[PDB]
Amino acid sequence: HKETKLSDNEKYLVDRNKEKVAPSKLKEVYNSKDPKYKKIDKYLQSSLFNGSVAIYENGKLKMSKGYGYQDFEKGIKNTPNTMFLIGSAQKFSTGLLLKQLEEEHKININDPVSKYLPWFKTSKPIPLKDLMLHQSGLYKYKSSKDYKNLDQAVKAIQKRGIDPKKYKKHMYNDGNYLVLAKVIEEVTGKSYAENYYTKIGDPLKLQHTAFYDEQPFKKYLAKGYAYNSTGLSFLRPNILDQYYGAGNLYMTPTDMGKLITQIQQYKLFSPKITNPLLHEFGTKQYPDEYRYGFYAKPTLNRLNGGFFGQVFTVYYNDKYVVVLALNVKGNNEVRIKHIYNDILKQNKPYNTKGVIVQ
Amino acid sequence: SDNEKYLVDRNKEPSKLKEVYNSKDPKYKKIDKYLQSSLFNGSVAIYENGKLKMSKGYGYQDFEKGIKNTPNTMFLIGSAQKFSTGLLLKQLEEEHKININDPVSKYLPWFKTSKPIPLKDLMLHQSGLYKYKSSKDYKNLDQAVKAIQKRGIDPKKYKKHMYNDGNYLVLAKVIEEVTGKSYAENYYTKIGDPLKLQHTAFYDEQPFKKYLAKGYAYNSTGLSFLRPNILDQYYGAGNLYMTPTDMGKLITQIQQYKLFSPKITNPLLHEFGTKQYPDEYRYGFYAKPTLNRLNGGFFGQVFTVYYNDKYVVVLALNVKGNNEVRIKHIYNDILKQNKPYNTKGVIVQ
Structure with a gap:
């Protein structure tokens, strides 16, 4: 920049992205020969899903696919490169x-x-x-x-x-x-953006995740939509400059899975820190299902954010991480449940209420 | 409380509706298949040239009591009561x-x-x-x-x-x-009864309580029932419950000039972009280029109507979600009704 009449967050990000080129192209991953994923794809297509899916199985990316449009006005289709406003999931x-x-x-x-x-x-x-x-x-x-x-x-x-x-x-x-x-x-004494990149973003190689105004990612930032009246209409984020930490981050579904699987593999904390953080609930320390921006539930762990016509939802356990991003507002929960419980058949004990996790 | 005074006295002293769905008709099979595989929770009613060709409930009316959606299920029409x-x-x-x-x-x-x-x-x-x-x-x-x-x-x-x-x-x-009369009385005497809408009711009418759908919205931490708590003050802007069949029955009868003469009805239903009817919106509903539209979103329910001179498509959803994409897919993609219907600017006879 120059005169620098910028907040600390933008200062950091502008300087960070001076010589940064657009992120690497991500490829579709979908194996129609695996009945599980064929069933999911078929469901997402016939249910008119508009957004993107990413599914990790035992740490590996087994499905990554975009459906419908990222930008309806410019006719840009949703791809694995499409980054969605994660909203309240940034709390994680x-x-x-x-x-x-x-x-x-x-x-x-x-x-x-x-x-x-x-x-x-x-x-x-x-x-x-x-x-x-x-x-x-x-x-x-x-x-x-x-x-x-x-x-x-x-x-x-x-x-x-x-x-x-x-x-x-x-x-x-x-x-x-x-x-x-x-x-x-x-x-x-440092910007949130800097703390995120230095302590999480870069260590975990999240290279398709960005704050709303980062230049090299603008190409891939999804537009959110809602029908209230007078057609399908774009809900422009107008407050994300004041929303650092509570939902001004954009992620590809793949990066979100990449984040969770790596945390599950003890890349940010030791097992004695990670296990309770991820699985202990109903205790003095972790009294509620909710902690540190996400939910530890009986059959699954859950993240979710609803913001400016987008819905970003994550259901996971030790085998599957299912990330479902929706940029036309609607019921994302029914979809991700159907995938996790009905198709992948993961409706089964995962975390135990009251147990002090080691 | 003139409204309840009238309704209580009216209801001092409804018939079971049957499913209508012919899987042998490719159009409706395609619709049903879509509604099932898209996990639709609510009810559909479709009229073709005035006749009821499809009427079917999907999922639950009440999740807590395990009551399935049937054609008898009445949904909070919300803003569609403006019509x-x-x-x-x-x-x-x-x-x-x-x-x-x-x-x-x-x-x-x-x-x-x-x-x-x-x-x-x-x-x-x-x-x-x-x-x-x-x-x-x-x-x-x-x-x-x-x-x-x-x-x-x-x-x-x-x-x-x-x-x-x-x-x-x-x-x-x-x-x-x-x-000098309650809204409820004006509705029944001037619309409800004349057009034999016998599966349509205000929120607190006793004989219909069995069939009043519950609305839902998983906001966070599971699927939760959104109890209407203000419908006593909402007479005229969305405290009415309707079966989808009754909504089609209402529109088809109006289309057939049963409330007004053609010289009143035609412009009311089809004139837009004129001194009289400047916008698509009028009298609680939309006259658009390819279709007429009603919609109400209220306490976890969505009640939407797309229609023209052939089809009246009524889609009621009691788990909150995107109802518009669904009704569009039915009207435009499956029934192939994306075609000129009303003409902007024309003074309709």
Whole structure:
């Protein structure tokens, strides 16, 4: 750049992508000779699915295929290279950074936000854990186009503050993970984008995953759609500059599977950290199915984000990682369930409620 | 509570509908096959040249009680009830009780507003009223419309389009005020009963409770039932439940000039891009180039209608999802009805 009137996130990303060319072309993977995947493909085609699928089996990519259009106006078809707005699934990225910071001894999950983010003052103290678990009592984040960066968003949330009746009760809230993203920035003294790339993106070779405004990936960024009235209409993201950590990231389904399988293989943490993070629920440490941006459930682990006409959903266990990205708004959950439970027949015990995982 | 007063007395003292599906007819076999393999949860009804050629339920009406969707299942039509309200409006115009270009204040004296809003601007969704925000507090239509009066007009939206349930709530009250009778009574006496709609009901009518579908939406952490909690204040803008068959029965009969003469019905149904009918939208529904459309999305349900002079396709979905892609695929791809129907600008006879 030049004059640099940019947030820390863009500063980092612009400099990072000065000499970066467009990412490598990804090929379709689909073996019609395997009845499972033939059944899936056939289902996705006849159900008029518009988006992309990626399925990993015992760590290997066994299916990767795009259906319908990435951009309906320009006639660009969905390919394996198509990157979808993952929305609330970015909370997993932020959770991983949190866990990393805990093991680096830079934060403690039961310490309050005010400790790491002095200006974030609140009627009562809020431990980092209560943000992470969506039980802080903060009013639901009301986005604004005014907000140019993460700082303004979290400084807006601080003004709105606590809702007494909802204190120490569960309430899903993007705002929680926006505050956590700022905590990450404040303790590290570095942008969220930098923390993500240095600590996750690059180590795990996620080369088809990008923040909304990165230049070399614009070619592949999917457009989301909804019918409310007057036809199929494109829902332009207008607030992703203030949404660092709670859903301004774009991923190919393959990269999402690549991320999860590598974490499953202990590439970010040791087994004693990874196993409970991924599988322990109903315990003092991991009281809910939800933790660090994702769900550990009885038969499966789940990620999901719904944002600007897109739906990005992940069902997985130790054999399959199923990533289903939808850029025309609709019911993605019925689809991914049908694939995971009905076709792949994975409706079976996976995690055990109450057990202290080793 | 004039609406319930009428309905309770009406219902002091419905027939089972059978499946209609001929797998030997390739069109309908293709539709059924699509609906099954796409995991459709709801009900379909298709009329061909006035006759019911397909009527079938898929998946569950109530997932908790294991009740399957049948042709008897009645779905929350939501914003498609605006069509009912529009029909009542048009009826009142032809009875010479209201004029569409006269202001609301004329017929509803207490509904005062910084600038006058003609009935037409409400009907067309261009009143400039701030988008209705409901509340559980409101026990009836009156409180809802007295709430919307309170907040008034939004400058800049003064005379431009903005979809708003509130518009048709104020029109429903206009109907009540001019007739001196409840909306429910006006609907039954002027539409429901004349057109033998016997599997259509307001949310709280007792004899139909058995068949009222539950809407769902897995937002996070499983499939969850979205209980309607505001339908007492939503008379005219989406508190009605219909079987898909009744919706087709309604449209085909209107098409056959059973509510109005052809000189009234034809433009109502087909004229768009004119002084009288400037937009595709009118009286609660859309007249488009290749088709006429109704749609309502409310409490986890989606109720959509595509039709022309041959087919009326009614598709009801009680697990929230993309109903439009489905009904398009049926109407355009399978039934091959993507072809000129209404003509923009033409003054229709």
